[PDB]
């Protein structure tokens, strides 16, 4: 359990969506305009395999686009900061996707977004240590590079932890997707390819979704489509 509360682009601070804003909205009808998506999981919980074909897998529970967008040059590093507490969950991979928006991302139909994998990290076979343990050891921070070749445009980045402590059972994998609006500028010239609807990323029986984390692992298939 946890959420992306803020993030940096080339060191520069950007405000993310925090749970306090959900309660602001309940009380007053409005909340601060931020690049992180609004979402309604009040515990900072997860989406389950039985929800892999539902709108909630796109950007988490009842999610809606942030009212503004951040911005970054292609080749920039994003550092997602998870919180408010230390990440609980030392087992599992970390993946990040990007999708382009037709028009502003602030008003996009999330269900029409098509995702391209730009980062993935699993288990180090020699240490048996997962990417999520590395996240805990890096102060809840994860670095993702925006591909240098990516052409300017309005994009959404979908950063996701797949906590695998329960993955040996059907429906046990816990997905924590978090979306942020980040427009891209600069000197990249390549269009994003066709990509994959979020509802087609994962199946409950995929080899890296349903597996035993409590035994020595010599081969692991990180879930989702191929790295771009």
Ligand X SMILES: *[C@@H]1O[C@H](CO)[C@@H](O[C@@H]2O[C@H](CO)[C@@H](O)[C@H](O)[C@H]2NC(C)=O)[C@H](O)[C@H]1NC(C)=O
Lookup: tokens for 23: 């309660």
* Partner in contact with 32, chosen from ligand X, Ni ion, none, beta carbon below 5 to 8 Å by kind: none
* Partner in contact with 6, chosen from ligand X, Ni ion, none, beta carbon below 5 to 8 Å by kind: ligand X
**DSSP per position, 39-65:** ---TTS--B-GGGTTSTHHHHSTT-B-
Lookup: tokens for 125: 């076979």
Q: Is 1 in the site for Ni ion (CB under 5 A)?
A: yes
- How many residues bind to ligand X according to rule CB under 6 A? 7
Q: How far apart are CA 216 and CA 84, in angstroms?
A: 32
Residue 65 CB, nearest distance to ligand X (Å)?
Answer: 21
Residue 63: which of 98, 101, 14, 110 has the closest Cα? Answer: 110
Task: Name the 3-class secondary structure at 50.
Answer: helix
Beta strands in 112-164 (DSSP E): 114-121, 123-124, 129-130, 141-145, 153-163
Q: Is 178 in the site for ligand X (CB under 6 A)?
A: no
Which residue of this chain has its Cβ atom nearest to ligand X in the complex? Answer: 83
Binding test (CB under 6 A) with ligand X, winner from 140, 154, 174, 196: 140
Q: How far apart are CA 2 and CA 87, in angstroms?
A: 7
Nearer to ligand X, 83 or 153 (CB): 83
- How many residues bind to Ni ion according to rule CB under 5 A? 2
Task: Name the 3-class secondary structure at 146.
Answer: coil
Q: How far apart are CA 76 and CA 147, in angstroms?
A: 8
Nearer to ligand X, 19 or 222 (CB): 19
* Partner in contact with 133, chosen from Ni ion, ligand X, none, beta carbon below 5 to 8 Å by kind: none
- CA atoms within a 13 Å half-sphere pointing along the CA-CB vector of 16: 24
Q: Known binder of ligand: residue 165?
A: yes
CB atoms within 10 A of CB 54: 13
What mask of x and - would describe binding to ligand X in positions 64 to 93, judged by CB under 6 A? -----------------x-xx-x-------
Residue 70: which of 196, 179, 166, 172 has the closest Cα? Answer: 179
Nearer to Ni ion, 85 or 88 (CB): 88
Stretch that binds Ni ion, among 82-90, 119-127, 180-188, 215-223 (CB under 5 A): 82-90
Nearer to ligand X, 86 or 170 (CB): 86
* Chain residues that interact with ligand X, rule: CB under 6 A: 5-6, 81, 83-84, 86, 140
Residues contributing to the annotated binding site for Cu(2+) = 1, 89, 176
* Chain residues that interact with Ni ion, rule: CB under 5 A: 1, 88
């Amino acid at each position: 359990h946890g959420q992306v509360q803020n993030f940096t682009i080339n060191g520069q601070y950007n405000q993310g969506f925090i749970l306090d804003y959900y309660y602001q909205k309940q009380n007053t009808g409005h909340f601060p305009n931020v690049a992180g998506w609004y979402a309604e999981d009040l515990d900072l919980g997860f989406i389950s395999p039985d929800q892999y074909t539902t709108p909630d897998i796109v950007c988490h529970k009842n999610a809606a686009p942030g009212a503004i967008s951040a911005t970054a040059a292609a080749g920039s590093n994003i550092v997602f900061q998870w919180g408010p507490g230390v990440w609980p969950h030392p087992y599992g991979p970390i993946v990040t996707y990007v999708v382009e928006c037709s028009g502003s991302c602030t008003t996009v139909n999330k269900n029409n977004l098509r995702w391209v994998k730009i980062q993935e990290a699993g288990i180090n076979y020699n240490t048996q240590v997962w990417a999520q343990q590395d996240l805990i050891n890096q102060g809840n921070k994860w670095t993702v590079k925006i591909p240098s070749s990516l052409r300017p445009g309005n994009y959404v980045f979908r950063h996701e932890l797949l906590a695998a402590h329960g993955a040996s059972s059907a429906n046990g994998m816990q997905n924590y997707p978090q979306c942020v609006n980040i427009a891209v500028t600069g000197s990249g010239t390549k269009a994003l390819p066709a990509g994959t609807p979020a509802t087609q990323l994962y199946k409950p029986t995929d080899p890296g979704i349903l597996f035993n984390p409590y035994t020595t692992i010599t081969s692991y298939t990180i879930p989702g489509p191929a790295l771009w």
